[PDB]
Amino acid sequence: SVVKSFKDLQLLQGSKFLQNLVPHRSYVSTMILEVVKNSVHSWDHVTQGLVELGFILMDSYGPKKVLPSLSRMPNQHACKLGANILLETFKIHEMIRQEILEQVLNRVVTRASSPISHFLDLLSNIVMYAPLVLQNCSSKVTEAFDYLSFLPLQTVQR
Amino acid sequence: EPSSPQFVQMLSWTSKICKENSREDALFCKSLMNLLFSLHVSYKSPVILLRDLSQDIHGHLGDIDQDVEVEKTNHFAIVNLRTAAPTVCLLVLSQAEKVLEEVDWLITKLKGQVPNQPVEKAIIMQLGTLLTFFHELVQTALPSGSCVDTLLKDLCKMYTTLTALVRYYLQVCQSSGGIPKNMEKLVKLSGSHLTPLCYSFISYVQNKSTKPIPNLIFAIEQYEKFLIHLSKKSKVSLMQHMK
DNA sequence: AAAAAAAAAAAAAAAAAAAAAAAAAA
DNA sequence: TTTTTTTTTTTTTTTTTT
């Protein structure tokens, strides 16, 4: 339901003839990012499923072809919807830090053969956003320092 | 920005270069036509430009029956015997494939829908203009490279879109009751103009001496079968328009 | 008034895309 | 003689059937 939405949006944006007919529909991307805003109050039931959708979108649609439009642009846009789900979910839900942050790190550290640039982007965003909110969930970082020797060099620099 | 006057200035300049300068070198014509199309399709539907370019291809290449004297060189100057035969045909058929994908998306959303009337009016307008476009190309003699099988595949896509359209008409005809008149002219044009010359083109490609031609004949017979069911369940005889 | 092989998991087939090789032109 | 393009092949992914 997310990949179909991005295919539809790419098809309309590439052609004016379809822009004249079809009146501007909300897409599943904007609806999901509304769910993450809505869930702040009491909806903790929702947010453990937001985290699983985030990492299913990133895990399934991340790059591999560099280690084209149709294999690239509705898969680039889903994988960057994933990171947006997890970064907006990380900011407001003060209890699924250490469930995103130990799972981002667990994909950066252990995979290291498949391309993982998207997780380093997400980890950069998560850190850079607030290291003030990461000093309450910091030991998940310093347990991946002990695995730094065995990584390839570019992953260590990154 | 695609609504700016500088967009229209760039589109007019590109079109003027396309209307004057010949330049017999395939890569230059291909990249310049791609620039023109890329500008055009973000402004308005390209079907007029596709129609004129098919007329140029028909005028340069000729006909299958070798007794049709047609020359329409006035339209677009970047059309040559060494340019329009290998390279321009693939580009105009690829853009036509894109327009067929767009109307397929519209047809599928119109099936799922049951905002109603102008949508289907624009759909049958694009299909009519593309029908005249395809009518101009089916009579021509293309080289036996990728061009002929690309024409068969895109004609299969054309007939598939027509089949899906009359399928939506089969879905909708019970609630309202009746066929709009523009659809009647469209099915007259598809029966009279396209399909006999499609048969003649199959004979033309077959006589000169394996998968696309069975696909195409299956597509056209499924079109005729769904048209039988529509002409029964619509209280109108659309086979007197057909041959 | 006529139409279908869909029947939780797995396997096979088809399609598409990417890479490699070969041929041609300067 | 080299570089680019085109054509073919192989691999991977998705869908449909048992």
JSON list of N, CA and C in Angstrom, two decimals, chain B residues 36-105:
[
{"chain": "B", "resi": 36, "resn": "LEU", "atom": "N", "xyz": [12.73, 17.89, -26.62]},
{"chain": "B", "resi": 36, "resn": "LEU", "atom": "CA", "xyz": [11.43, 18.48, -27.02]},
{"chain": "B", "resi": 36, "resn": "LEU", "atom": "C", "xyz": [10.31, 17.76, -26.29]},
{"chain": "B", "resi": 37, "resn": "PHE", "atom": "N", "xyz": [10.34, 16.42, -26.29]},
{"chain": "B", "resi": 37, "resn": "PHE", "atom": "CA", "xyz": [9.27, 15.61, -25.68]},
{"chain": "B", "resi": 37, "resn": "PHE", "atom": "C", "xyz": [9.25, 15.83, -24.19]},
{"chain": "B", "resi": 38, "resn": "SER", "atom": "N", "xyz": [10.42, 15.89, -23.57]},
{"chain": "B", "resi": 38, "resn": "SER", "atom": "CA", "xyz": [10.54, 16.04, -22.11]},
{"chain": "B", "resi": 38, "resn": "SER", "atom": "C", "xyz": [9.94, 17.37, -21.70]},
{"chain": "B", "resi": 39, "resn": "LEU", "atom": "N", "xyz": [10.11, 18.39, -22.54]},
{"chain": "B", "resi": 39, "resn": "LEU", "atom": "CA", "xyz": [9.52, 19.72, -22.26]},
{"chain": "B", "resi": 39, "resn": "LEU", "atom": "C", "xyz": [8.01, 19.67, -22.49]},
{"chain": "B", "resi": 40, "resn": "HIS", "atom": "N", "xyz": [7.59, 18.99, -23.54]},
{"chain": "B", "resi": 40, "resn": "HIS", "atom": "CA", "xyz": [6.19, 19.07, -24.03]},
{"chain": "B", "resi": 40, "resn": "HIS", "atom": "C", "xyz": [5.26, 18.40, -23.04]},
{"chain": "B", "resi": 41, "resn": "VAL", "atom": "N", "xyz": [5.60, 17.18, -22.60]},
{"chain": "B", "resi": 41, "resn": "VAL", "atom": "CA", "xyz": [4.72, 16.26, -21.81]},
{"chain": "B", "resi": 41, "resn": "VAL", "atom": "C", "xyz": [4.50, 16.83, -20.40]},
{"chain": "B", "resi": 42, "resn": "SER", "atom": "N", "xyz": [5.39, 17.68, -19.91]},
{"chain": "B", "resi": 42, "resn": "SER", "atom": "CA", "xyz": [5.18, 18.42, -18.65]},
{"chain": "B", "resi": 42, "resn": "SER", "atom": "C", "xyz": [4.36, 19.70, -18.87]},
{"chain": "B", "resi": 43, "resn": "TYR", "atom": "N", "xyz": [3.88, 19.97, -20.08]},
{"chain": "B", "resi": 43, "resn": "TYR", "atom": "CA", "xyz": [3.07, 21.18, -20.39]},
{"chain": "B", "resi": 43, "resn": "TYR", "atom": "C", "xyz": [1.67, 20.81, -20.86]},
{"chain": "B", "resi": 44, "resn": "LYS", "atom": "N", "xyz": [1.58, 20.04, -21.94]},
{"chain": "B", "resi": 44, "resn": "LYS", "atom": "CA", "xyz": [0.31, 19.45, -22.41]},
{"chain": "B", "resi": 44, "resn": "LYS", "atom": "C", "xyz": [0.57, 18.09, -23.10]},
{"chain": "B", "resi": 45, "resn": "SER", "atom": "N", "xyz": [-0.50, 17.34, -23.31]},
{"chain": "B", "resi": 45, "resn": "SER", "atom": "CA", "xyz": [-0.45, 15.97, -23.87]},
{"chain": "B", "resi": 45, "resn": "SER", "atom": "C", "xyz": [0.21, 15.98, -25.23]},
{"chain": "B", "resi": 46, "resn": "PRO", "atom": "N", "xyz": [1.11, 15.03, -25.52]},
{"chain": "B", "resi": 46, "resn": "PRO", "atom": "CA", "xyz": [1.94, 15.13, -26.72]},
{"chain": "B", "resi": 46, "resn": "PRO", "atom": "C", "xyz": [1.31, 14.64, -28.02]},
{"chain": "B", "resi": 47, "resn": "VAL", "atom": "N", "xyz": [0.05, 14.24, -27.98]},
{"chain": "B", "resi": 47, "resn": "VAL", "atom": "CA", "xyz": [-0.60, 13.41, -29.04]},
{"chain": "B", "resi": 47, "resn": "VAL", "atom": "C", "xyz": [-0.64, 14.13, -30.39]},
{"chain": "B", "resi": 48, "resn": "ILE", "atom": "N", "xyz": [-0.70, 15.46, -30.38]},
{"chain": "B", "resi": 48, "resn": "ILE", "atom": "CA", "xyz": [-0.65, 16.24, -31.63]},
{"chain": "B", "resi": 48, "resn": "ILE", "atom": "C", "xyz": [0.75, 16.08, -32.24]},
{"chain": "B", "resi": 49, "resn": "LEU", "atom": "N", "xyz": [1.78, 16.19, -31.41]},
{"chain": "B", "resi": 49, "resn": "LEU", "atom": "CA", "xyz": [3.19, 16.10, -31.86]},
{"chain": "B", "resi": 49, "resn": "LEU", "atom": "C", "xyz": [3.48, 14.68, -32.34]},
{"chain": "B", "resi": 50, "resn": "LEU", "atom": "N", "xyz": [2.93, 13.68, -31.65]},
{"chain": "B", "resi": 50, "resn": "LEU", "atom": "CA", "xyz": [3.08, 12.27, -32.06]},
{"chain": "B", "resi": 50, "resn": "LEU", "atom": "C", "xyz": [2.38, 12.08, -33.41]},
{"chain": "B", "resi": 51, "resn": "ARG", "atom": "N", "xyz": [1.23, 12.71, -33.60]},
{"chain": "B", "resi": 51, "resn": "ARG", "atom": "CA", "xyz": [0.46, 12.59, -34.85]},
{"chain": "B", "resi": 51, "resn": "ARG", "atom": "C", "xyz": [1.27, 13.16, -36.02]},
{"chain": "B", "resi": 52, "resn": "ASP", "atom": "N", "xyz": [1.81, 14.35, -35.82]},
{"chain": "B", "resi": 52, "resn": "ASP", "atom": "CA", "xyz": [2.56, 15.04, -36.89]},
{"chain": "B", "resi": 52, "resn": "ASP", "atom": "C", "xyz": [3.83, 14.24, -37.21]},
{"chain": "B", "resi": 53, "resn": "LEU", "atom": "N", "xyz": [4.51, 13.72, -36.19]},
{"chain": "B", "resi": 53, "resn": "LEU", "atom": "CA", "xyz": [5.75, 12.96, -36.41]},
{"chain": "B", "resi": 53, "resn": "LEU", "atom": "C", "xyz": [5.44, 11.63, -37.11]},
{"chain": "B", "resi": 54, "resn": "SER", "atom": "N", "xyz": [4.31, 11.02, -36.81]},
{"chain": "B", "resi": 54, "resn": "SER", "atom": "CA", "xyz": [3.90, 9.80, -37.55]},
{"chain": "B", "resi": 54, "resn": "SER", "atom": "C", "xyz": [3.61, 10.16, -39.01]},
{"chain": "B", "resi": 55, "resn": "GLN", "atom": "N", "xyz": [3.01, 11.32, -39.25]},
{"chain": "B", "resi": 55, "resn": "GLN", "atom": "CA", "xyz": [2.77, 11.78, -40.64]},
{"chain": "B", "resi": 55, "resn": "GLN", "atom": "C", "xyz": [4.10, 11.97, -41.37]},
{"chain": "B", "resi": 56, "resn": "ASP", "atom": "N", "xyz": [5.10, 12.53, -40.69]},
{"chain": "B", "resi": 56, "resn": "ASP", "atom": "CA", "xyz": [6.43, 12.71, -41.31]},
{"chain": "B", "resi": 56, "resn": "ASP", "atom": "C", "xyz": [7.07, 11.36, -41.61]},
{"chain": "B", "resi": 57, "resn": "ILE", "atom": "N", "xyz": [6.95, 10.42, -40.68]},
{"chain": "B", "resi": 57, "resn": "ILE", "atom": "CA", "xyz": [7.54, 9.07, -40.86]},
{"chain": "B", "resi": 57, "resn": "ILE", "atom": "C", "xyz": [6.86, 8.40, -42.05]},
{"chain": "B", "resi": 58, "resn": "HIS", "atom": "N", "xyz": [5.54, 8.57, -42.17]},
{"chain": "B", "resi": 58, "resn": "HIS", "atom": "CA", "xyz": [4.75, 7.98, -43.27]},
{"chain": "B", "resi": 58, "resn": "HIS", "atom": "C", "xyz": [5.14, 8.62, -44.61]},
{"chain": "B", "resi": 59, "resn": "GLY", "atom": "N", "xyz": [5.38, 9.93, -44.61]},
{"chain": "B", "resi": 59, "resn": "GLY", "atom": "CA", "xyz": [5.74, 10.66, -45.83]},
{"chain": "B", "resi": 59, "resn": "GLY", "atom": "C", "xyz": [7.13, 10.30, -46.31]},
{"chain": "B", "resi": 60, "resn": "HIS", "atom": "N", "xyz": [8.07, 10.14, -45.38]},
{"chain": "B", "resi": 60, "resn": "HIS", "atom": "CA", "xyz": [9.47, 9.82, -45.73]},
{"chain": "B", "resi": 60, "resn": "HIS", "atom": "C", "xyz": [9.59, 8.36, -46.15]},
{"chain": "B", "resi": 61, "resn": "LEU", "atom": "N", "xyz": [9.07, 7.44, -45.32]},
{"chain": "B", "resi": 61, "resn": "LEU", "atom": "CA", "xyz": [9.29, 5.99, -45.52]},
{"chain": "B", "resi": 61, "resn": "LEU", "atom": "C", "xyz": [8.44, 5.47, -46.66]},
{"chain": "B", "resi": 62, "resn": "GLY", "atom": "N", "xyz": [7.17, 5.88, -46.72]},
{"chain": "B", "resi": 62, "resn": "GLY", "atom": "CA", "xyz": [6.23, 5.43, -47.76]},
{"chain": "B", "resi": 62, "resn": "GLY", "atom": "C", "xyz": [5.20, 4.47, -47.22]},
{"chain": "B", "resi": 63, "resn": "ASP", "atom": "N", "xyz": [4.57, 3.73, -48.13]},
{"chain": "B", "resi": 63, "resn": "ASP", "atom": "CA", "xyz": [3.42, 2.85, -47.83]},
{"chain": "B", "resi": 63, "resn": "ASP", "atom": "C", "xyz": [3.81, 1.42, -48.21]},
{"chain": "B", "resi": 64, "resn": "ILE", "atom": "N", "xyz": [2.96, 0.47, -47.83]},
{"chain": "B", "resi": 64, "resn": "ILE", "atom": "CA", "xyz": [3.19, -0.98, -48.10]},
{"chain": "B", "resi": 64, "resn": "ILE", "atom": "C", "xyz": [2.76, -1.33, -49.53]},
{"chain": "B", "resi": 65, "resn": "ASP", "atom": "N", "xyz": [1.78, -0.61, -50.09]},
{"chain": "B", "resi": 65, "resn": "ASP", "atom": "CA", "xyz": [1.14, -0.93, -51.39]},
{"chain": "B", "resi": 65, "resn": "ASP", "atom": "C", "xyz": [1.88, -0.25, -52.56]},
{"chain": "B", "resi": 66, "resn": "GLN", "atom": "N", "xyz": [2.91, 0.56, -52.27]},
{"chain": "B", "resi": 66, "resn": "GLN", "atom": "CA", "xyz": [3.84, 1.25, -53.22]},
{"chain": "B", "resi": 66, "resn": "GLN", "atom": "C", "xyz": [3.10, 2.07, -54.29]},
{"chain": "B", "resi": 67, "resn": "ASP", "atom": "N", "xyz": [1.87, 2.52, -54.01]},
{"chain": "B", "resi": 67, "resn": "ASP", "atom": "CA", "xyz": [1.11, 3.41, -54.93]},
{"chain": "B", "resi": 67, "resn": "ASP", "atom": "C", "xyz": [0.36, 4.47, -54.12]},
{"chain": "B", "resi": 68, "resn": "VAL", "atom": "N", "xyz": [1.01, 4.98, -53.07]},
{"chain": "B", "resi": 68, "resn": "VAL", "atom": "CA", "xyz": [0.49, 6.12, -52.27]},
{"chain": "B", "resi": 68, "resn": "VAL", "atom": "C", "xyz": [1.60, 7.17, -52.24]},
{"chain": "B", "resi": 69, "resn": "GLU", "atom": "N", "xyz": [1.35, 8.32, -52.88]},
{"chain": "B", "resi": 69, "resn": "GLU", "atom": "CA", "xyz": [2.33, 9.42, -53.00]},
{"chain": "B", "resi": 69, "resn": "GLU", "atom": "C", "xyz": [1.99, 10.47, -51.95]},
{"chain": "B", "resi": 70, "resn": "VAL", "atom": "N", "xyz": [2.60, 10.37, -50.78]},
{"chain": "B", "resi": 70, "resn": "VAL", "atom": "CA", "xyz": [2.32, 11.28, -49.65]},
{"chain": "B", "resi": 70, "resn": "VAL", "atom": "C", "xyz": [3.65, 11.88, -49.17]},
{"chain": "B", "resi": 71, "resn": "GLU", "atom": "N", "xyz": [3.70, 13.21, -49.08]},
{"chain": "B", "resi": 71, "resn": "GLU", "atom": "CA", "xyz": [4.89, 13.94, -48.59]},
{"chain": "B", "resi": 71, "resn": "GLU", "atom": "C", "xyz": [4.39, 15.10, -47.73]},
{"chain": "B", "resi": 72, "resn": "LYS", "atom": "N", "xyz": [4.72, 15.08, -46.44]},
{"chain": "B", "resi": 72, "resn": "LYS", "atom": "CA", "xyz": [4.25, 16.09, -45.47]},
{"chain": "B", "resi": 72, "resn": "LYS", "atom": "C", "xyz": [5.46, 16.66, -44.73]},
{"chain": "B", "resi": 73, "resn": "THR", "atom": "N", "xyz": [6.43, 17.11, -45.51]},
{"chain": "B", "resi": 73, "resn": "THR", "atom": "CA", "xyz": [7.77, 17.51, -45.00]},
{"chain": "B", "resi": 73, "resn": "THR", "atom": "C", "xyz": [7.68, 18.82, -44.21]},
{"chain": "B", "resi": 74, "resn": "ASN", "atom": "N", "xyz": [6.60, 19.59, -44.42]},
{"chain": "B", "resi": 74, "resn": "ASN", "atom": "CA", "xyz": [6.31, 20.88, -43.76]},
{"chain": "B", "resi": 74, "resn": "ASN", "atom": "C", "xyz": [6.28, 20.76, -42.23]},
{"chain": "B", "resi": 75, "resn": "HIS", "atom": "N", "xyz": [5.94, 19.60, -41.68]},
{"chain": "B", "resi": 75, "resn": "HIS", "atom": "CA", "xyz": [5.63, 19.48, -40.24]},
{"chain": "B", "resi": 75, "resn": "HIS", "atom": "C", "xyz": [6.89, 19.68, -39.40]},
{"chain": "B", "resi": 76, "resn": "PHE", "atom": "N", "xyz": [7.88, 18.80, -39.56]},
{"chain": "B", "resi": 76, "resn": "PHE", "atom": "CA", "xyz": [9.08, 18.75, -38.69]},
{"chain": "B", "resi": 76, "resn": "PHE", "atom": "C", "xyz": [10.31, 18.43, -39.52]},
{"chain": "B", "resi": 77, "resn": "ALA", "atom": "N", "xyz": [11.27, 19.36, -39.51]},
{"chain": "B", "resi": 77, "resn": "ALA", "atom": "CA", "xyz": [12.42, 19.34, -40.43]},
{"chain": "B", "resi": 77, "resn": "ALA", "atom": "C", "xyz": [13.41, 18.24, -40.07]},
{"chain": "B", "resi": 78, "resn": "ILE", "atom": "N", "xyz": [13.46, 17.81, -38.80]},
{"chain": "B", "resi": 78, "resn": "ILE", "atom": "CA", "xyz": [14.44, 16.78, -38.34]},
{"chain": "B", "resi": 78, "resn": "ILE", "atom": "C", "xyz": [13.84, 15.40, -38.58]},
{"chain": "B", "resi": 79, "resn": "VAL", "atom": "N", "xyz": [13.70, 15.08, -39.86]},
{"chain": "B", "resi": 79, "resn": "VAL", "atom": "CA", "xyz": [13.16, 13.80, -40.36]},
{"chain": "B", "resi": 79, "resn": "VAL", "atom": "C", "xyz": [13.94, 13.52, -41.64]},
{"chain": "B", "resi": 80, "resn": "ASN", "atom": "N", "xyz": [14.74, 12.46, -41.63]},
{"chain": "B", "resi": 80, "resn": "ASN", "atom": "CA", "xyz": [15.61, 12.11, -42.77]},
{"chain": "B", "resi": 80, "resn": "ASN", "atom": "C", "xyz": [15.45, 10.63, -43.06]},
{"chain": "B", "resi": 81, "resn": "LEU", "atom": "N", "xyz": [15.92, 10.22, -44.23]},
{"chain": "B", "resi": 81, "resn": "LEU", "atom": "CA", "xyz": [15.84, 8.80, -44.65]},
{"chain": "B", "resi": 81, "resn": "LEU", "atom": "C", "xyz": [16.74, 7.93, -43.77]},
{"chain": "B", "resi": 82, "resn": "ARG", "atom": "N", "xyz": [17.82, 8.52, -43.25]},
{"chain": "B", "resi": 82, "resn": "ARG", "atom": "CA", "xyz": [18.78, 7.84, -42.35]},
{"chain": "B", "resi": 82, "resn": "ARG", "atom": "C", "xyz": [18.48, 8.13, -40.88]},
{"chain": "B", "resi": 83, "resn": "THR", "atom": "N", "xyz": [17.58, 9.07, -40.59]},
{"chain": "B", "resi": 83, "resn": "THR", "atom": "CA", "xyz": [17.23, 9.46, -39.20]},
{"chain": "B", "resi": 83, "resn": "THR", "atom": "C", "xyz": [15.89, 8.82, -38.80]},
{"chain": "B", "resi": 84, "resn": "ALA", "atom": "N", "xyz": [14.84, 9.04, -39.59]},
{"chain": "B", "resi": 84, "resn": "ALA", "atom": "CA", "xyz": [13.45, 8.68, -39.21]},
{"chain": "B", "resi": 84, "resn": "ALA", "atom": "C", "xyz": [13.21, 7.17, -39.29]},
{"chain": "B", "resi": 85, "resn": "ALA", "atom": "N", "xyz": [14.04, 6.42, -40.01]},
{"chain": "B", "resi": 85, "resn": "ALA", "atom": "CA", "xyz": [13.82, 4.97, -40.19]},
{"chain": "B", "resi": 85, "resn": "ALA", "atom": "C", "xyz": [14.32, 4.18, -38.98]},
{"chain": "B", "resi": 86, "resn": "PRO", "atom": "N", "xyz": [15.58, 4.31, -38.48]},
{"chain": "B", "resi": 86, "resn": "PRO", "atom": "CA", "xyz": [15.99, 3.51, -37.32]},
{"chain": "B", "resi": 86, "resn": "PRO", "atom": "C", "xyz": [15.57, 4.04, -35.93]},
{"chain": "B", "resi": 87, "resn": "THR", "atom": "N", "xyz": [15.59, 5.36, -35.72]},
{"chain": "B", "resi": 87, "resn": "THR", "atom": "CA", "xyz": [15.74, 6.00, -34.39]},
{"chain": "B", "resi": 87, "resn": "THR", "atom": "C", "xyz": [14.47, 6.73, -33.95]},
{"chain": "B", "resi": 88, "resn": "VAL", "atom": "N", "xyz": [13.79, 7.43, -34.85]},
{"chain": "B", "resi": 88, "resn": "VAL", "atom": "CA", "xyz": [12.67, 8.32, -34.45]},
{"chain": "B", "resi": 88, "resn": "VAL", "atom": "C", "xyz": [11.44, 7.48, -34.13]},
{"chain": "B", "resi": 89, "resn": "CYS", "atom": "N", "xyz": [11.25, 6.39, -34.87]},
{"chain": "B", "resi": 89, "resn": "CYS", "atom": "CA", "xyz": [10.14, 5.43, -34.71]},
{"chain": "B", "resi": 89, "resn": "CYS", "atom": "C", "xyz": [10.11, 4.86, -33.29]},
{"chain": "B", "resi": 90, "resn": "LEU", "atom": "N", "xyz": [11.26, 4.47, -32.77]},
{"chain": "B", "resi": 90, "resn": "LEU", "atom": "CA", "xyz": [11.35, 3.87, -31.41]},
{"chain": "B", "resi": 90, "resn": "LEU", "atom": "C", "xyz": [10.95, 4.92, -30.38]},
{"chain": "B", "resi": 91, "resn": "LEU", "atom": "N", "xyz": [11.34, 6.17, -30.59]},
{"chain": "B", "resi": 91, "resn": "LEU", "atom": "CA", "xyz": [11.05, 7.25, -29.63]},
{"chain": "B", "resi": 91, "resn": "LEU", "atom": "C", "xyz": [9.56, 7.60, -29.63]},
{"chain": "B", "resi": 92, "resn": "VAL", "atom": "N", "xyz": [8.97, 7.71, -30.81]},
{"chain": "B", "resi": 92, "resn": "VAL", "atom": "CA", "xyz": [7.53, 8.06, -30.91]},
{"chain": "B", "resi": 92, "resn": "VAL", "atom": "C", "xyz": [6.69, 6.88, -30.39]},
{"chain": "B", "resi": 93, "resn": "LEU", "atom": "N", "xyz": [7.14, 5.64, -30.60]},
{"chain": "B", "resi": 93, "resn": "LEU", "atom": "CA", "xyz": [6.39, 4.49, -30.07]},
{"chain": "B", "resi": 93, "resn": "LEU", "atom": "C", "xyz": [6.56, 4.40, -28.56]},
{"chain": "B", "resi": 94, "resn": "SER", "atom": "N", "xyz": [7.71, 4.80, -28.02]},
{"chain": "B", "resi": 94, "resn": "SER", "atom": "CA", "xyz": [7.94, 4.75, -26.56]},
{"chain": "B", "resi": 94, "resn": "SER", "atom": "C", "xyz": [7.06, 5.79, -25.88]},
{"chain": "B", "resi": 95, "resn": "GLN", "atom": "N", "xyz": [6.97, 6.98, -26.45]},
{"chain": "B", "resi": 95, "resn": "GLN", "atom": "CA", "xyz": [6.11, 8.03, -25.86]},
{"chain": "B", "resi": 95, "resn": "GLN", "atom": "C", "xyz": [4.65, 7.60, -25.97]},
{"chain": "B", "resi": 96, "resn": "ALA", "atom": "N", "xyz": [4.26, 6.94, -27.07]},
{"chain": "B", "resi": 96, "resn": "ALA", "atom": "CA", "xyz": [2.88, 6.44, -27.24]},
{"chain": "B", "resi": 96, "resn": "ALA", "atom": "C", "xyz": [2.58, 5.38, -26.18]},
{"chain": "B", "resi": 97, "resn": "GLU", "atom": "N", "xyz": [3.55, 4.52, -25.88]},
{"chain": "B", "resi": 97, "resn": "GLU", "atom": "CA", "xyz": [3.45, 3.51, -24.80]},
{"chain": "B", "resi": 97, "resn": "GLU", "atom": "C", "xyz": [3.20, 4.19, -23.45]},
{"chain": "B", "resi": 98, "resn": "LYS", "atom": "N", "xyz": [3.89, 5.30, -23.21]},
{"chain": "B", "resi": 98, "resn": "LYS", "atom": "CA", "xyz": [3.70, 6.09, -21.98]},
{"chain": "B", "resi": 98, "resn": "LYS", "atom": "C", "xyz": [2.27, 6.65, -21.92]},
{"chain": "B", "resi": 99, "resn": "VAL", "atom": "N", "xyz": [1.75, 7.16, -23.03]},
{"chain": "B", "resi": 99, "resn": "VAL", "atom": "CA", "xyz": [0.37, 7.73, -23.04]},
{"chain": "B", "resi": 99, "resn": "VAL", "atom": "C", "xyz": [-0.65, 6.60, -22.83]},
{"chain": "B", "resi": 100, "resn": "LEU", "atom": "N", "xyz": [-0.37, 5.42, -23.37]},
{"chain": "B", "resi": 100, "resn": "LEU", "atom": "CA", "xyz": [-1.25, 4.27, -23.15]},
{"chain": "B", "resi": 100, "resn": "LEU", "atom": "C", "xyz": [-1.21, 3.84, -21.69]},
{"chain": "B", "resi": 101, "resn": "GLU", "atom": "N", "xyz": [-0.06, 3.93, -21.03]},
{"chain": "B", "resi": 101, "resn": "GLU", "atom": "CA", "xyz": [0.01, 3.60, -19.59]},
{"chain": "B", "resi": 101, "resn": "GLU", "atom": "C", "xyz": [-0.83, 4.60, -18.81]},
{"chain": "B", "resi": 102, "resn": "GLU", "atom": "N", "xyz": [-0.80, 5.87, -19.20]},
{"chain": "B", "resi": 102, "resn": "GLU", "atom": "CA", "xyz": [-1.55, 6.90, -18.47]},
{"chain": "B", "resi": 102, "resn": "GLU", "atom": "C", "xyz": [-3.05, 6.66, -18.58]},
{"chain": "B", "resi": 103, "resn": "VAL", "atom": "N", "xyz": [-3.54, 6.33, -19.77]},
{"chain": "B", "resi": 103, "resn": "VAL", "atom": "CA", "xyz": [-4.99, 6.07, -19.93]},
{"chain": "B", "resi": 103, "resn": "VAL", "atom": "C", "xyz": [-5.36, 4.73, -19.31]},
{"chain": "B", "resi": 104, "resn": "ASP", "atom": "N", "xyz": [-4.44, 3.77, -19.25]},
{"chain": "B", "resi": 104, "resn": "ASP", "atom": "CA", "xyz": [-4.68, 2.50, -18.53]},
{"chain": "B", "resi": 104, "resn": "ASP", "atom": "C", "xyz": [-4.90, 2.78, -17.04]},
{"chain": "B", "resi": 105, "resn": "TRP", "atom": "N", "xyz": [-4.06, 3.63, -16.47]},
{"chain": "B", "resi": 105, "resn": "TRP", "atom": "CA", "xyz": [-4.22, 4.05, -15.06]},
{"chain": "B", "resi": 105, "resn": "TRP", "atom": "C", "xyz": [-5.57, 4.73, -14.86]}
]
